[PDB]
Each structure stands twice: as structure tokens, then as C-alpha cells.
């Protein structure tokens, strides 16, 4: 889906970080523990949101107007 | 906002009344989905 606004435990927004993290992975391909350390989620219970979250929006938007 | 019945392929904001044609025009499929709401209905973000 979309990455959730305000990663549920903390509630710090991380849905800003998705496109920058997307280009960070596609552009540099590091270990994602370091990639999220660059985008700065220090606690693992909020690191889980970007490490986990699956998008299905593109496979949704392939379909039709 | 003139839109009543819109098929899939012909996204066609044309019309429909009682027993006009079960097939739509410009494509022979006959599903006939109906268009959305004119007025506005309000919801809570809770």
C-alpha cells in the first residue's frame, strides 16, 4: 500500500521518507540498516515500517482509467 | 457534473432511462455501470 502516515508506535512521520528511500535503494543499493540510518530511524520499532512495508499501488495503477 | 451511466471501455457520460438499451454504444459490451454522486456527503476522519 502506501507507507503509513505516522509509524504507529512513535507517530513520527515516515511517509515523507519513501520516495527518497526508494531512490536511495535504486540509486545506491546499500545495506538497508545503513540506509535507514541515513534516513534516521534510530529505534527498531520504527525502523520496521520502512524495512517491512510493501507497496501494491503500482500493481493497482497498472489497470485502467 | 452531467454524468449518469458510464461504461468501462466507452467512458461515456451519455444518459440512461428505463429500458433504453442494455448494450452501450461505440462498444458492444453491455455492463452499464452508473455514475457517482452529484451532491456531497461528508465523513469524519476518525
Amino acid at each position: 500500500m502506501i507507507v503509513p502516515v505516522r509509524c504507529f508506535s512513535c507517530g513520527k512521520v515516515v511517509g515523507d521518507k519513501w520516495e527518497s528511500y526508494l531512490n536511495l535503494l535504486q540509486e545506491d543499493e546499500l545495506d538497508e540498516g545503513t540506509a535507514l540510518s541515513r534516513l534516521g530511524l534510530k529505534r527498531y520499532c520504527c525502523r520496521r515500517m520502512i524495512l517491512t512495508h510493501v507497496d501494491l499501488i503500482e500493481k493497482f495503477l497498472r489497470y485502467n482509467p | 457534473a452531467t454524468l449518469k451511466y458510464i461504461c468501462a471501455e466507452c467512458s461515456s457520460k451519455l444518459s440512461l432511462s428505463r429500458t433504453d438499451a442494455v448494450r452501450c454504444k461505440d462498444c458492444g459490451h453491455r455492463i452499464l455501470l452508473k455514475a457517482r454522486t452529484k451532491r456531497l456527503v461528508q465523513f469524519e476522519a476518525r
Partner: protein, 266 residues
């Protein structure tokens, strides 16, 4: 000074860290609780949709809209829509937002935070700015759409604190830990052979000394020398949230005194 001394260490725009020494235990705990829950904040509450053909639901999109944080510097001069005596919303108790996003670029038409335009007359108040904390200046990833799809809203934003919901909480994961070298015997660590080697040498051990192993057991000491790490979303900066929180705690204790004056005269 007299009582609570503040000794601020490393800070930032959105990070505070401070030895809050010579304060009481439940005083610290009450402070972190009121700064979690008890601060008013503008965010979007009522949502009226005109038309939508996107892949997301109206209710889902409205839930994201509610989870958008706006600028809340000027919370004090905005009324509740319950205590405002108008007809359900006005321009002193409500903030109207209007957003129409259409797509024609045929490759992943996007919608973000910075599309919001405050069509309501803000009366010159620092409110309602969608918080672009973004490095590349975009905002939260709101919606994705194509040609025929469309995003048409009419929203009203209101006040409130983190106890109605989680949508009116700018607090964001406030920490609290005192006394690493445990002379208070509030906690014995789980251990097989040795807690000092098994359990890790913790973080805030630098400031208070190692507890001088060969001593008998102290009983007199209370809770002192707290190191409370705070944070924020960005609806208000991290000083003003501690300001408004201590202010609302002071106001509620003044409400206790208000009830006492209600009592001892009548």
C-alpha cells in the same frame, strides 16, 4: 537556583536532551504524560468529497488527510468548535482546506503534502502550513493516480489534544530514564553468571559515577538526576511543546484551585 535545575546537553531543532536534576519522580512522570497527551493541535477532522475515481478509498484518503500534521504555532487563539457559539464552524474555530488534484501526465501522477492551499482566511495566524520537513521539499506521499483519476476535497481542520485520538498528538515517542548505575535497587537484572558482564553497560552511565562497589546499601535516596529525551513531529518546535505542556499542567492545577474556591465559598 532553588528546586528543579535544568542542564541542557546536545540539542537540535527537533531533539532535546537534558539532565533535569533535583526534581521529584512523579513530577517527571506527570510532565512526560501531559506532554504526551495534553496539548492542543490543529489537524483535519471533517471531510467532504465531491468526486473520486482513484484507487484508494474516500475514507482511507480522509484518514490520511487526518493524519497529515499542519502548522500549529498559533494554537492559543483558535477556538474549539464546541465552545465557539457559531453555527457549527466559523473562521475562529475552524480551518478550511480545499484541494483539487487532476492528472494528465501519463507516468505515475503524484500528490504530496505541499499541494494543500489554505483557502480559508487565516486572519494572519501561523497555522495550517503543511509541514515540509522534507530534504527534497515534497512532503508525505499522499496519493498516486493517472489520467482519468482525480482528487477533490473540501476539508475542515480543528483543535484538540492527543486523548481524543492519535491524530492530535504531536508528541512522538518521549523517553524517560533515571539512574543507570542502580544504587536504588529498583531492579535486579536477569542473569546467569554476572549481570555486569551479561547486561550491557548502558548509555547514560557517563554522568553519574559508577556506584563504587564496596559500599553498604543506601536506603535514604529518592529519585534524582533524570535524563528525559523528547522529540516532536514538527507541528510546533520542540521548545514550544514543552512550554505549552508545562503551561497546560499549570493550568489544570490552577483548575484544582478553581474547584477549591468553588468549594470553600459554597
Amino acid at each position: 537556583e532553588e528546586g528543579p535545575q535544568v542542564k541542557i546537553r546536545e540539542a537540535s531543532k527537533d531533539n532535546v536532551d537534558f539532565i533535569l536534576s533535583n526534581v521529584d519522580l512523579a513530577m517527571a512522570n506527570s510532565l512526560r504524560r501531559v506532554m504526551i497527551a495534553e496539548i492542543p493541535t490543529l489537524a483535519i477532522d471533517s471531510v467532504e468529497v465531491e468526486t473520486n475515481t482513484t484507487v484508494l478509498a474516500d475514507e482511507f484518503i480522509a484518514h490520511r488527510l487526518g493524519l497529515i500534521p499542519l502548522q500549529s504555532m498559533d494554537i492559543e487563539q483558535l477556538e474549539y468548535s464546541r465552545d465557539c457559539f457559531c453555527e457549527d464552524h466559523c473562521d475562529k474555530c475552524s480551518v478550511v482546506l480545499t484541494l483539487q488534484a487532476f492528472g494528465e501526465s501519463e507516468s505515475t501522477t503524484n500528490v504530496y503534502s505541499k499541494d494543500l492551499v489554505i483557502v480559508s482566511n487565516l486572519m494572519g495566524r501561523n497555522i495550517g502550513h503543511p509541514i515540509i520537513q522534507d530534504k527534497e521539499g515534497n512532503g508525505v506521499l499522499i496519493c498516486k493516480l493517472r489520467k482519468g483519476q482525480e482528487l477533490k476535497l473540501t476539508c475542515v481542520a480543528k483543535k484538540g489534544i492527543a486523548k481524543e485520538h492519535a491524530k492530535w498528538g504531536p508528541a512522538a515517542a518521549i523517553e524517560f530514564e533515571y539512574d543507570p548505575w542502580n544504587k536504588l535497587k529498583h531492579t535486579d537484572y536477569w542473569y546467569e553468571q554476572d549481570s555486569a558482564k551479561e547486561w550491557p553497560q548502558s548509555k547514560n552511565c557517563e554522568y553519574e559515577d559508577p556506584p563504587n562497589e564496596g559500599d553498604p546499601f543506601d536506603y535514604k535516596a529518592q529519585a534524582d538526576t533524570f535524563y528525559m529525551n523528547v522529540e516532536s513531529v514538527g507541528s510546533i518546535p520542540v521548545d514550544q511543546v514543552v512550554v505549552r505542556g508545562i503551561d497546560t499542567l499549570q493550568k489544570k492545577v490552577a483548575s484544582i484551585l478553581l474547584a477549591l474556591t468553588q468549594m470553600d465559598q459554597d
